[PDB]
Swiss-Prot record, chain A:
Superkingdom as given in the UniProt entry: Viruses
Gene: S
Subunit structure: Binds to host ACE2. RBD also interacts with the N-linked glycan on 'Asn-90' of ACE2. Cleavage of S generates a polybasic C-terminal sequence on S1 that binds to host Neuropilin-1 (NRP1) and Neuropilin-2 (NRP2) receptors. Interacts with host integrin alpha-5/beta-1 (ITGA5:ITGB1) and with ACE2 in complex with integrin alpha-5/beta-1 (ITGA5:ITGB1). May interact via cytoplasmic c-terminus with M protein. May interact (via N-terminus) with host bilirubin and biliverdin, thereby preventing antibody binding to the SARS-CoV-2 spike NTD via an allosteric mechanism.
Cited function: Attaches the virion to the cell membrane by interacting with host receptor, initiating the infection. The major receptor is host ACE2. When S2/S2' has been cleaved, binding to the receptor triggers direct fusion at the cell membrane. When S2/S2' has not been cleaved, binding to the receptor results in internalization of the virus by endocytosis using host TFRC and GRM2 and leading to fusion of the virion membrane with the host endosomal membrane. Alternatively, may use NRP1/NRP2 and integrin as entry receptors.
Protein's name according to its UniProt entry: Spike protein S1
Classification of source organism: Viruses, Riboviria, Orthornavirae, Pisuviricota, Pisoniviricetes
Section covered of the full-length record: 351 to 399 of 1273
Length: 49, 49
């Protein structure tokens, strides 16, 4: 109920090391796809952990 | 009635007036998808709710 919010901007949101890693168990993008994530540009991304 | 099925993953967009009935499992990552299943191997066909 007090999830932290970290603003991520002005960087490259690389996902090779993220997706190719087997550490994660479940990961679904319901609005985008990893294949087109590389060639897509975003304004700001917040991480809520 | 879930008998209606539709394809979800494809290697590339199908050309006009093309029929695709292949049932081989799809791989969303760089890792190989051998056999009938594997890491993040998704069946191309999803039922209709
Ligand atoms: C932070 O998390 C990442 C996990 O992605 C660790 O870096 C490597 O990530 C790749 C994924 O491609 C793995 O193959 C490596 O095994 C990871 N290296 C390890 C586990 O040492 C990174 O080490 C982590 N940093 C920490 C825990 O301090």
């Amino acid at each position: 109920y007090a999830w932290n919010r970290k603003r991520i901007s002005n960087c490259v949101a690389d996902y090779s090391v993220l997706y190719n890693s087997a550490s994660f168990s479940t990961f679904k993008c319901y609005g985008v796809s990893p294949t087109k994530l590389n060639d897509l540009c975003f304004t700001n991304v917040y991480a809520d952990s | 009635n879930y008998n209606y099925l539709y394809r979800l993953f494809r290697k590339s967009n199908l050309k006009p007036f093309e029929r695709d009935i292949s049932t081989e499992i799809y791989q969303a990552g760089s890792t190989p998808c051998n056999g009938v299943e594997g890491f993040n191997c998704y069946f191309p066909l999803q039922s209709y709710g």
